[PDB]
Amino acid sequence: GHEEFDIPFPSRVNPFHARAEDRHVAWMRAMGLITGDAAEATYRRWSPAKVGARWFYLAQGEDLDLGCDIFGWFFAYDDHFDPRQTAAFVNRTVAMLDPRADPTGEHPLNIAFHDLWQRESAPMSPLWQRRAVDHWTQYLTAHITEATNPTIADYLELRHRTGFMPPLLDLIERVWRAEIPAPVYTTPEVQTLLHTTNQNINIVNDVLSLEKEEAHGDPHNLVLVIQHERQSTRQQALATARRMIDEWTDTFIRTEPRLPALCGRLGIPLADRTSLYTAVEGMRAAIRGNYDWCAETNRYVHTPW
Amino acid sequence: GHEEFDIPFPSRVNPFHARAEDRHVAWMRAMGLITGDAAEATYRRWSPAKVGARWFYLAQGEDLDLGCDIFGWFFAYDDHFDPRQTAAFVNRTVAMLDPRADPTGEHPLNIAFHDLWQRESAPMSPLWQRRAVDHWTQYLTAHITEATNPTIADYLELRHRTGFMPPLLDLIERVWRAEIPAPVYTTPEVQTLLHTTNQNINIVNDVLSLEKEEAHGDPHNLVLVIQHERQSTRQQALATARRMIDEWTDTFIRTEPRLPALCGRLGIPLADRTSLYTAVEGMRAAIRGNYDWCAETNRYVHTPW
Numbered sequence: 001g002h003e004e005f006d007i008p009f010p011s012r013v014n015p016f017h018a019r020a021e022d023r024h025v026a027w028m029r030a031m032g033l034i035t036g037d038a039a040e041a042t043y044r045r046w047s048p049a050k051v052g053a054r055w056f057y058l059a060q061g062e063d064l065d066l067g068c069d070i071f072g073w074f075f076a077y078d079d080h081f082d083p084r085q086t087a088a089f090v091n092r093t094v095a096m097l098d099p100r101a102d103p104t105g106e107h108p109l110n111i112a113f114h115d116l117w118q119r120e121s122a123p124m125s126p127l128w129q130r131r132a133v134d135h136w137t138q139y140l141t142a143h144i145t146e147a148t149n150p151t152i153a154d155y156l157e158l159r160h161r162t163g164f165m166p167p168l169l170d171l172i173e174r175v176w177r178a179e180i181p182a183p184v185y186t187t188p189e190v191q192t193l194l195h196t197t198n199q200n201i202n203i204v205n206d207v208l209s210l211e212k213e214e215a216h217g218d219p220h221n222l223v224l225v226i227q228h229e230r231q232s233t234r235q236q237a238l239a240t241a242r243r244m245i246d247e248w249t250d251t252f253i254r255t256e257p258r259l260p261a262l263c264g265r266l267g268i269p270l271a272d273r274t275s276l277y278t279a280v281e282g283m284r285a286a287i288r289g290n291y292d293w294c295a296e297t298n299r300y301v302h303t304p305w
Numbered sequence: 306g307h308e309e310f311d312i313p314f315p316s317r318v319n320p321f322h323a324r325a326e327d328r329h330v331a332w333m334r335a336m337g338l339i340t341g342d343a344a345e346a347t348y349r350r351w352s353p354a355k356v357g358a359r360w361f362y363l364a365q366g367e368d369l370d371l372g373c374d375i376f377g378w379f380f381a382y383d384d385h386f387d388p389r390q391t392a393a394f395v396n397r398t399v400a401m402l403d404p405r406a407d408p409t410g411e412h413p414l415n416i417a418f419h420d421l422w423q424r425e426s427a428p429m430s431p432l433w434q435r436r437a438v439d440h441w442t443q444y445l446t447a448h449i450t451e452a453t454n455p456t457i458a459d460y461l462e463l464r465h466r467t468g469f470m471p472p473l474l475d476l477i478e479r480v481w482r483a484e485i486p487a488p489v490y491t492t493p494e495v496q497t498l499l500h501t502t503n504q505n506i507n508i509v510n511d512v513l514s515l516e517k518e519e520a521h522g523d524p525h526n527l528v529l530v531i532q533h534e535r536q537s538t539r540q541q542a543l544a545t546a547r548r549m550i551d552e553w554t555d556t557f558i559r560t561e562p563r564l565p566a567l568c569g570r571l572g573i574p575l576a577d578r579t580s581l582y583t584a585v586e587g588m589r590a591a592i593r594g595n596y597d598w599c600a601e602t603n604r605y606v607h608t609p610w
């Protein structure tokens with residue numbers, strides 16, 4: 001009952017997905033993002049912790065909880081925006097990235113983000129933290145740009161450079177406890193793996209959340225952007241999206257086999273290489289987990305806040 | 306403290322590994338393969354259910370138990386043999402593959418194998434069962450050949466065509482509940498993945514169990530075979546094994562990216578493709594799990610039976 005894609009990794013879900021949902025809902029209620037039983041029941045119908053459970057299929061305990069909480073927080077933060085007021089709010093979210101931030105008195109979404117960032121950043125290196133602050137800041141401030149406000153090219157550039165995927169890619173390293181070695185992070189090979197994971201997930205979500213977004217008047221969807229730019233039919237635009245998804249998947253799987261030799265040329269110790277391979281497995285899991293979750297979730301029936 | 310290899314997959318262990326050991330030991334005791342507390346304590350020191358726990362890192366319940374029990378049975382069966390008496394015994398093991406077999410009165414090793422096979426075969430297709438019977442029969446009867454009795458080439462051929470890996474490859478499909486689609490099983494691509502998994506695991510085990518096998522006077526090890534054939538040093542032979550291991554690993558990861566396009570050319574439905582991708586993930590987990598387990602297990606200190 002949905003568009004189907006050939007994503008060449010197995011479907012997997014964390015064995016502790018059920019308990020993870022209870023803990024995640026409890027966090028959402030404690031942070032004031034879900035209020036009352038009716039909202040909670042509506043929210044649970046989305047399987048909202050299952051997206052984290054699929055991305056992070058072997059995480060346990062606080063690592064799993066962080067992975068699940070990021071996505072639930074995203075749903076709440078994203079739906080909050082549905083320019084002066086936006087800038088004031090978003091600048092408070094960005095302020096929670098400061099190591100000395102005090103969340104007292106902030107809006108609940110920003111108190112929650114402060115909690116997420118503290119848990120996400122604490123075990124990671126200064127190198128990871130620098131780029132993670134940049135990636136979070138871009139995702140957050142992009143809401144201001146949205147309020148002030150594309151071609152197909154503009155949309156694709158905006159999604160990959162200022163969307164939610166750059167933070168989610170950094171999160172993979174945290175939840176898997178597998179930071180990518182700095183000397184390989186900037187290589188064309190790893191940047192390609194990151195970029196193709198970024199766009200694959202963006203556009204698989206666009207295809208699978210299309211009916212929801214149309215129903216809500218939400219224009220930020222590649223399929224709608226293609227149609228508007230090219231005056232193409234719905235099927236034409238969906239087929240264009242499909243070809244793009246398939247090309248990114250193909251680029252990912254053709255690129256991964258280069259990594260061991262690359263690590264050898266860079267003199268990376270073997271234990272550090274296993275960190276890289278673990279992050280890349282996390283990318284595989286994210287690509288497949290995004291597809292399986294977007295395909296199954298009631299969020300995309302086409303409100304708990 | 307051991308030879309190290311670049312195996313480009315993450316290290317993973319089933320979250321239920323601890324309970325899995327208790328259940329596996331109880332099975333070994335119920336089948337008469339472990340007798341007494343001393344033997345049990347010695348056996349546990351090997352982390353004997355941990356090899357199944359690494360191969361099958363998401364399996365649960367009876368699927369996980371089967372995966373762990375296979376390896377424990379292998380240790381006991383393989384250590385039973387360390388030609389007329391061998392043939393009489395092995396022929397009883399092969400007879401347990403027949404659906405009409407009665408295990409009553411058989412040797413405990415054969416009663417146990419009968420139990421394993423009933424559990425392994427029950428959910429599998431007749432096509433899988435025919436080739437699984439063949440692979441088991443070749444592994445079992447090869448003990449007769451060993452009793453009657455190589456060049457490097459002969460050894461390598463014997464290990465991959467009649468050793469324990471062909472049954473373990475079939476077991477991957479069972480434990481993951483992911484049968485390889487019949488039309489793709491015989492393709493050069495899938496046969497290459499099976500062959501490289503086969504040889505990689507064989508020779509990684511030879512390198513990492515070498516000292517144990519030398520201490521026991523066991524000559525069935527590629528490193529010893531190379532030295533004997535070439536009159537080469539220990540380091541020379543280990544370096545040869547290393548080059549072979551690396552080449553099989555490289556062949557595996559260069560071949561996997563061909564599978565989606567192959568499935569397209571063969572007209573394989575997408576759900577069947579995900580079965581293939583799952584079995585291939587099982588091969589990745591086996592390659593890495595074998596390396597990690599052989600590196601950590603006290604079985605390789607250099608007896609519970």
Ligand SMILES: CC(C)=CCC/C(C)=C(/F)COP(=O)(O)OP(=O)(O)O
Pocket residue numbers: 051071074078163164165201202205206209290294
């Ligand atoms: C599936 C998921 C939670 C995240 C991965 C995709 C992604 C990068 C988003 F920003 C969510 O897409 P969108 O902003 O379109 O949100 P929607 O309303 O489709 O859930």
Ligand SMILES: CC(C)=CCC/C(C)=C(/F)COP(=O)(O)OP(=O)(O)O
Pocket residue numbers: 356376379383468469470506507510514595599604
């Ligand atoms: C590690 C494991 C159980 C299996 C993978 C290797 C393999 C295919 C074997 F047949 C082990 O044979 P061998 O008789 O050399 O096993 P050992 O005596 O070294 O434990």
Ligand SMILES: CC[N+](C)(C)CCCS(=O)(=O)[O-]
Pocket residue numbers: 016019059060061062064320321323
């Ligand atoms: C043995 C398995 N244990 C440790 C109990 C799993 C706990 C998983 S958790 O922390 O996500 O609930």
Ligand SMILES: CC[N+](C)(C)CCCS(=O)(=O)[O-]
Pocket residue numbers: 015016018321324364365366367369
């Ligand atoms: C919720 C997690 N459960 C299903 C209880 C794990 C049981 C794993 S098992 O069957 O291997 O013990």
Ligand SMILES: CCC(CO)(CO)CO
Pocket residue numbers: 003235236238239242
């Ligand atoms: C809806 C299916 C399709 C358009 O007909 C788009 O994915 C197939 O190419």
Ligand SMILES: CCC(CO)(CO)CO
Pocket residue numbers: 308540541543544547
């Ligand atoms: C013992 C290491 C080595 C021989 O010196 C074999 O793996 C390195 O090539």
Ligand SMILES: [Mg+2]
Pocket residue numbers: 078
């Ligand atoms: Mg949205």
Ligand SMILES: [Mg+2]
Pocket residue numbers: 205206209210213
């Ligand atoms: Mg969407």
Ligand SMILES: [Mg+2]
Pocket residue numbers: 383
């Ligand atoms: Mg042996």
Ligand SMILES: [Mg+2]
Pocket residue numbers: 510511514515518
């Ligand atoms: Mg050995």
